[PDB]
Amino acid sequence: AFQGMTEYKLVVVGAGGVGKSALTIQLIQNHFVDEYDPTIEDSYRKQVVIDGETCLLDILDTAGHEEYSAMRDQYMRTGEGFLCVFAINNTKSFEDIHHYREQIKRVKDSEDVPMVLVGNKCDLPSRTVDTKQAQDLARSYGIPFIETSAKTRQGVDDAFYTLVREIRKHKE
């Protein structure tokens, strides 16, 4: 029966420049990317142990704005869980979260899709989104909220591991 470790397909979504790539590269390479090189689509893989279970994370790092609609629908269909990322110094990115979540719910035709709300750049001083407002949004969705910094690494492992735990709860 066991043919190899369990694989989880994770998709990182959110507005341009919120730190999707930086979060992922911090997880994979333990490296902070200071440059802003806009992504088209990149795939990463990492084996980790979460709650005593070995797993392979297949992580799709997406473009903030994806014009080809058909490619976007494809990764939403294939993804098992979604990190919905905003930047705590960018109110507009926070307002956009609702739109990412709606699109995902429509493609998966479900109210109950594994997701984590991620407030990134929590190292920066010019916060415009209060922690309490983000926590309230996440509570309204029934999903976890995690504050992260791709720079300091605060919350980075937690965000990805929490998402895996959400997928597991959903599969059971």
Ligand X SMILES: Nc1nc2c(ncn2[C@@H]2O[C@H](COP(=O)(O)OP(=O)(O)NP(=O)(O)O)[C@@H](O)[C@H]2O)c(=O)[nH]1
Ligand Y SMILES: COc1nc(-c2cccc3c2O[C@H](CNC(=O)C2CCOCC2)CO3)ccc1Nc1cccc(CN(C)C)c1
By beta-carbon proximity to ligand X, the closer residue of 49 and 124 is 124
- Kindly tell me which residue out of 58, 66, 157, 158 binds ligand Y, with binding defined by CB under 6 A: 58
Question: Does the footprint of ligand Y cover residue 110 (CB under 6 A)?
Answer: no
Annotated binding-site residue? 12: no
Smallest gap, in angstroms, from Cβ of residue 78 to ligand Y? 3
Select from ligand Y, ligand X, Mg ion, none the partner in contact with residue 158, using the beta carbon and a kind-dependent cut-off of 5 to 8 Å.
none
Long-range contacts of 121-124 (CB under 8 A, 24+ apart): 121/18, 121/19, 121/87, 121/88, 121/89, 121/90, 121/149, 121/150, 121/151, 122/88, 122/147, 122/148, 122/149, 122/154, 122/155, 123/149, 123/151, 123/152, 123/154, 124/88, 124/89
Please state, as a whole number, how many other Cβ atoms lie within 10 Å of the Cβ of residue 39. 15
**In the structure encoding, which two tokens stand for residue 126, read together?**
């010019």
| Contact region with ligand X (CB under 6 A), list: 11-19, 76-84, 106-114, 157-165 | 11-19
Q: Print the binding letters for residues 1-40 with ligand Y: x by CB under 6 A, - otherwise.
A: --------xxx-----------------------------
- 34 contacts ligand X (rule: CB under 6 A): yes
17 marked as part of a ligand binding site: yes
Nearest to 49 by CA among 6, 105, 97, 111: 6
Residues that bind ligand X (CB under 6 A): 16-22, 33-34, 36, 38-39, 63-64, 120-121, 123-124, 149-151
